[PDB]
Symmetry: C3
Subunit: 334 residues, 3 copies
């Protein structure tokens, strides 16, 4: 491997993706990444907080992008200020529980894992210390995604090359914040203190919150995603613990790999697709109309009550051939 090129990557926070090339500009390389585990309380919504544990300080953890055949070398750091052991499980990797069996680090320790990205597709990576700690760390926010692109870029159902202009990584996460009898949420001093109460909520399998980018409304309003008519946007969607059903209200999924593995034929013209808990999928869409769109988990209760809604603001010219208000809302009243 000493004869292989090495590339150091600088991760960017979700929903954005670090600089990369869709078509590998060279042969296999060793991709170097680094992440610092950060334990901190985060505001999921008004009067709703989570004693979170995160990869690099964000929920979801940052998106890593490499090419099939490349190697991935991740330096994982657990700062001394943290309270618990952590590790990492790459669904894109082969062996040792995705790397989990070789990356258990206590506060104050670091580890470097190398694995060969032998299979193309978007994959989930997440913490999994062992036993009950596995689901707890994940629902506390410790999960992200790594996208392994085919060396010759994405291909459609006919083998034709497809390209995107922008990648938006939508990391959906389900959380189980304990509630008082009146429905209000509980707050704790640290992750450990709220464990017992959180387990009770987890056992009901009913999330208190289901969010994109770690908080209700994170990608709405001023945080709304941007695009222009004509843009081919690849929406990579991950859900490490629970199913989701992504939909771009106002648009469609032109090409969709709901199971997220690129060598499989993608489906076309979907209104809503399905992301299995414990996986990442991808949908490509070319914007044809300007305006506001709503990217959601299409169980509308989960989208609106739980928080699984993002907004996309698209600039450009309107096309009346596709849609037109023939008769505007009108009528007498009293």
């Amino acid at each position: 491997l000493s004869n292989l090129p090495r590339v150091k990557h600088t991760l960017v926070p979700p929903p954005f993706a670090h600089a990369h090339e869709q078509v590998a500009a060279s042969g296999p390389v060793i991709n170097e990444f680094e992440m610092r585990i950060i334990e901190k309380e985060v505001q999921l919504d008004e009067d709703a907080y989570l004693q979170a544990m995160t990869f690099d300080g964000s929920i979801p953890g940052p998106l890593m992008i490499v090419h099939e055949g490349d190697y991935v070398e991740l330096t994982l750091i657990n700062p001394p200020e943290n309270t618990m052991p952590h590790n990492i499980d790459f669904h894109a990797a082969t062996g040792a529980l995705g790397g989990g069996g070789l990356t258990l680090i206590n506060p104050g320790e670091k580890v470097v894992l190398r694995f060969k990205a032998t299979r193309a597709g978007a994959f989930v990576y997440h913490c999994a210390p062992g036993g009950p700690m596995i689901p707890w760390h994940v629902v506390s926010g410790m999960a992200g995604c790594i996208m392994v692109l085919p060396r010759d870029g994405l291909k459609d159902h006919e083998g034709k090359p497809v390209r995107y202009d922008t990648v938006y990584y939508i990391g959906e996460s389900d959380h189980y914040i304990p509630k008082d009898e009146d429905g209000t949420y509980m707050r704790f001093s640290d992750p450990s203190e709220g464990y017992e109460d959180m387990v009770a909520v987890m056992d009901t399998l009913i999330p208190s919150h289901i969010v994109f980018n770690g908080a209700v409304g994170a990608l709405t309003g001023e945080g709304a995603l941007k695009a222009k008519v004509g843009d081919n946007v690849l929406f990579v969607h991950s859900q490490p613990n629970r199913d989701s059903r992504p939909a771009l209200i106002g648009g469609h999924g032109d090409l969709v790999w709901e199971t997220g593995k690129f060598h499989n034929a993608p489906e076309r013209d979907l209104e809503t697709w399905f992301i299995r808990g414990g996986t990442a999928g991808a949908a490509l869409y070319k914007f044809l109309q300007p305006g506001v769109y709503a990217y959601v988990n299409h169980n509308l209760i989960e989208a609106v009550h739980k928080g699984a809604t993002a907004h996309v603001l698209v600039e450009g010219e309107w096309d009346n051939d596709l849609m037109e208000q023939v008769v505007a809302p009108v009528g007498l009243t009293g």
Copy 2:
């Protein structure tokens, strides 16, 4: 832009400059920079403190160096420990108030701005959140410089190539620390607390301190700059809010671009030049004599009472043809 090379730069603290090449060793590239905003109290002088806000923990912010035609991608980070929103305005950029309208980040947020460095010259970059916050953040220390070199290096008034051996970035900053009736300076717990009192001083337009590298005497004594006879030193001087009149006591400005834009003809043999508030200029000088030099803002009150003085210690052999003490101080007394 995916076909353009990417170069990751590691910034060094002022008055020094990160490694670079005067003549572009290749075609246009995308220059990647990262800075962390740091809010902290700094000692401007004995018994004089400033609740500062800085780019990367220094005043001035670090110097960025790229070439005309290149792109600049800056990752700006506002850590959660900070108290206020911040952003960045690049005078070298075109649009959105220099980037200010696209980089407003609250504590705990990050942003990445890309702009094309279409014009050669030294430019100021500074924070400008909006309204009254603009001058306040700047005089609190949030300003630096980015130098955009012509792809074929610097040229003189005749178009002849000129080269420097060393670059010293002198960031001059004016501060307005509140005073008690006896002239002593006030101290506060954080930036916000001292705002009202600082505004009163700002309104007088009289700085309490005018310093190089963020403190009185920062570049004097043990912090004195070093050089050798024969060295061609480029003194890049910035002042984001108030005029300055740089002068190298003991020397001159061999070639000077006081308005700081390299495609303009530089002036020669200056004794003192002028840096307009809100700009950066550059002066090149070849040392001919060893000894101590004083680089100052030539309003001597501002240089000595306010703090605008730096020292340069030059090693080498003395040249009697240029200057000689014919008769040493002598005389009877009583």
Copy 3:
């Protein structure tokens, strides 16, 4: 030097080594390294603590690897939270006390030193502020190693090329923790407070602890080093202040440069070698048998009572030709 390639390195914690090539893949380059000085109390053993001062948060400081003829540019950072001045002395460098006279930085300061690695070999680098501070900072943990490989890789006593599969940097450090009359160890709030008491122990020249990787048992048990039969492992051993006598129990030193300078002929088949205090040496060994090995300072009291013991777990097939239990422990008793 502007015409020389620049390579940015990411250091990894000891006993591991950052990615590198044994044979220089190109002509001379400028190697860029960065380290943050961290002052923190560390647990040397059960009920034994050290108010440590470290390079990059580890003891020993991380291993730097470059090639003879290259230049080394180290950015040293002394964060504002630290309490004392620090600097760095590279035994691999020429002039200014190894760089110590040009790198004295107070808390809140940074410095960048460049030196030419003109001589091949493993060298110690350590803090040396001046006077009594020199030994104190070193025995507080401020020492590491830089390995300068010949451009054409390592060579044996006959000039034949030798290669290793893995490098393990064993940084041995002697500490002098004050003891109560009953033998128990004292604890302090910061380095300065325990200085006077530590000096008394230092004067006896008897270390309370002698450890690998900064703590008793750091590289034993779960921290045991790993290897496979057939692996050529290079054990680089440093001791900045006191002599050590490394030995690989169960194996040997196939090729050993105990004085650590690669152009000198290495010795073969050693059972134990010698590392002079203030130096780094290197020993290469090819594992022939699977099982547990003990890498130790062969003054067994220092190895077992003081802490100088590391374990190596080797996987592979056993070779009865080399060793076999002909008659297992047997006999009548009562």
